[PDB]
Design an enzyme around this catalytic site. Structure first.
Site, PDB file in Angstrom:
ATOM      1  N   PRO A 127       0.766  -1.399  -0.212  1.00 50.45           N
ATOM      2  CG  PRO A 127      -1.264  -1.491   1.453  1.00 50.45           C
ATOM      3  CD  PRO A 127       0.981  -2.122   0.773  1.00 50.45           C
ATOM      4  CD  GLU A 128       2.154   3.057   3.899  1.00 47.55           C
ATOM      5  OE1 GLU A 128       2.170   3.934   4.694  1.00 47.55           O
ATOM      6  OE2 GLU A 128       1.341   2.485   3.650  1.00 47.55           O
ATOM      7  CB  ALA A 129       5.179   0.891  -3.076  1.00 45.26           C
TER       8      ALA A 129
END
Ligand SMILES: *[C@@H]1O[C@H](CO)[C@@H](O[C@@H]2O[C@H](CO)[C@@H](O[C@@H]3O[C@H](CO[C@@H]4O[C@H](CO)[C@@H](O)[C@H](O)[C@@H]4O)[C@@H](O)[C@H](O[C@H]4O[C@H](CO)[C@@H](O)[C@H](O)[C@@H]4O)[C@@H]3O)[C@H](O)[C@H]2NC(C)=O)[C@H](O)[C@H]1NC(C)=O
Ligand SMILES: OC[C@H]1O[C@@H](O)[C@H](O)[C@@H](O)[C@H]1O
Lengths: 251, 264
Positions: A162-164
């Site tokens: 998600p962060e990526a």
């Protein structure tokens, strides 16, 4: 219900393939959206029909193990995961989730929530000291497949997916991690942009499309841990490389 | 629901060669010209942006002496100023423009004391501004295509793509606020394009605020040359030291660029 999917196989996976993965991921959730400054704003909750609220992510470890996680299209949050017939949901799990996800699998409710702080405490360690990369990811899948050390393992998945998808800066770090199979712990800046996604989302939306300056400033950490405040889009982008926006305002 | 109206904020204006926009000698008297000057704390260098699309220092609005190419900028009373010579827009491309006339703030030269004016938008680097409290340029690594980095080599007149080495001084760039990209330890050199046509090479020229040296980092991952609308492209054909050129946007990977800040 049958939700679209995006898979990533660690076996013989290159940095390019990974890039392609984070690409399909964004497209799947950035559907039916108006964008600001080129960045799409995840559909509001009151707009996404249940049939298109969750997207399934399929990650396979070197030894063939496959763990599936369902991400909420409205906030790009990881809401639950299933492996080998079983599925798991956090304590805050809304009926909507269980009711529509992984039907046909023995579902389980977890003793904790999906907060970066909750996860951290439950894990017994802080994001800052956890390693990310090819191996950590592979070893993270196996752990979940065997329902063990689920907390700390979720922290690897979250930051590596998600962060990526959110920050292209992270996408890079991770990308490089694959390219030359090593491992890294998140630095002050990385975690800094992770905890302020919402603020950034706010600042960006307030000013509106094209307007460069922010009414307020975003607090970000430098490598040395020295406070840093970005007050204009270009600055925010150039530093984070943000890709998705979280609906907060409406402009 | 509905974006809350923000309160007036105070920031400075960084532009050409890194100089700041400030009222001459700090005179709050109506008519005082606007000029460039090293970035300091001096109250006259501070600008407050109100929702009325007007920016003002020491209470006086930033006004366009005239509404045609060449007219100088200065401060004056908002209540008596012209309702158009006081309206400004700050765009992400680094463009400060006046809605009515369509002319944009310009900096003929990078020499402090230079009076700013309203000019025809030709997207030159002399028309590139960045308003923020952080007046320093962001030092970064320009990563691209094959995980290689943009590297200035030799007599800082050429830019090839080579394996990324953070410690290599020739791989460190300073993203100036005037929208130009320069060599960190040679901030007088700007990444420049040899022209506005596809396949036109990209080298390193002296910084002069030309339209050929004005770059815009689009959120889609591409870097554009506002004047030509062409983006930075890496010649795939090359085995090693592949060169970069300006080519029409296509979406392909070799037109993707990630600014990895090494310091900030
Ligand atoms: C990108 O490009 C910019 C522009 O050049 C670089 O910024 C410069 O970096 C250098 C390298 O660090 C900076 O020099 C440092 O200056 C220190 C202070 O020296 C002065 O002392 C006199 C005393 O008479 C004062 O009057 C001055 O005001 C200065 O304070 C100098 O001491 C330091 O050396 C260090 O050595 C060790 C640490 O290893 C310590 O013991 C020592 O005290 C000191 O910390 C450096 O020489 C320079 O100031 C910067 N200039 C600007 C304009 O930013 C960036 O470094 C480049 N980016 C990258 C990533 O390299
Ligand atoms: O070039 C004239 C200068 O006059 C000074 O008094 C002022 O502090 C400077 O910022 C600059 O305006």
């Amino acid at each position: 219900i049958d939700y679209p999917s995006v898979s990533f196989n660690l076996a013989g996976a290159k940095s390019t393939t990974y890039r392609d993965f984070l690409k399909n991921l964004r497209d799947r959730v950035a559907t039916g959206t108006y964008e600001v400054n080129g960045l799409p704003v995840l559909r509001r909750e009151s707009e996404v029909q249940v049939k298109n609220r969750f997207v399934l992510v399929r990650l396979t470890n070197y030894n063939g193990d496959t763990v599936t996680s369902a991400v909420d299209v409205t906030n790009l949050y990881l809401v639950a995961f299933s492996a080998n017939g079983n599925s798991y949901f956090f304590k805050d799990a809304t009926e909507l989730q269980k009711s529509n996800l992984f039907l046909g699998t023995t579902q389980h409710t977890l003793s904790f929530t999906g907060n970066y702080d909750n996860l951290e405490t439950a894990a017994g360690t802080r994001r800052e000291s956890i390693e990310l990369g090819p191996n950590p990811l592979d070893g993270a899948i196996t752990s979940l497949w065997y329902d063990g050390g689920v907390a700390r393992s979720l922290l690897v998945l979250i930051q590596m997916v998600p962060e990526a998808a959110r920050f292209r800066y992270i996408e890079q770090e991770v990308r490089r991690s694959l390219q030359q199979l090593t491992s890294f712990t998140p630095n002050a800046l990385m975690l800094s942009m992770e905890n302020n996604w919402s603020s950034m989302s706010l600042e960006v939306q307030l000013s509106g499309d094209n307007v460069s300056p922010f009414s307020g400033t975003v607090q970000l950490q430098n490598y040395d841990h020295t406070p840093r405040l970005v007050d204009n889009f270009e600055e925010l982008y150039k530093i984070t490389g943000i890709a998705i926006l979280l609906f907060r305002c409406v402009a | 629901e509905t974006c809350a109206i923000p309160a007036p904020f105070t920031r400075r204006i960084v532009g050409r060669d890194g100089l700041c926009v400030d009222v001459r000698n700090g005179y709050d008297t109506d008519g005082t010209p606007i000029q460039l000057w090293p970035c300091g704390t001096q109250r006259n260098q501070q600008w407050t942006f109100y929702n009325d699309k007007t920016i003002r220092s020491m209470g006086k609005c930033m006004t366009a002496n005239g509404l045609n190419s060449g007219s100088y900028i200065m401060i004056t009373d908002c209540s008596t100023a012209a309702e158009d010579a006081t309206k400004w827009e700050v765009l992400i491309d680094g463009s400060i423009i006046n809605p009515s006339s369509g002319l944009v703030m310009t900096a003929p030269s990078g020499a402090s004391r230079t009076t700013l004016l309203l000019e025809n938008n030709i997207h030159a680097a002399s028309q590139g501004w960045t308003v923020s409290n952080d007046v320093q340029p962001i030092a970064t690594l320009i990563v691209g295509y094959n995980e290689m980095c943009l590297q200035a080599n030799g007599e800082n007149n050429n830019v090839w793509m080579e394996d990324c080495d953070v410690t290599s001084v020739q791989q460190q760039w300073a993203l100036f606020d005037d929208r130009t990209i320069r060599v960190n330890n040679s901030r007088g050199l700007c990444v420049t394009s040899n022209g506005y046509v596809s396949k036109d090479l990209i080298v390193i020229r002296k910084c002069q605020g030309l339209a050929t040296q004005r770059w815009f980092f689009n959120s889609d991952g591409s870097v554009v040359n506002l004047k030509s609308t062409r983006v930075m492209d890496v010649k795939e054909s090359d085995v090693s030291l592949q060169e970069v050129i300006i080519f029409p946007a296509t979406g392909n990977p070799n037109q993707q660029w990630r600014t990895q800040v090494p310091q900030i």
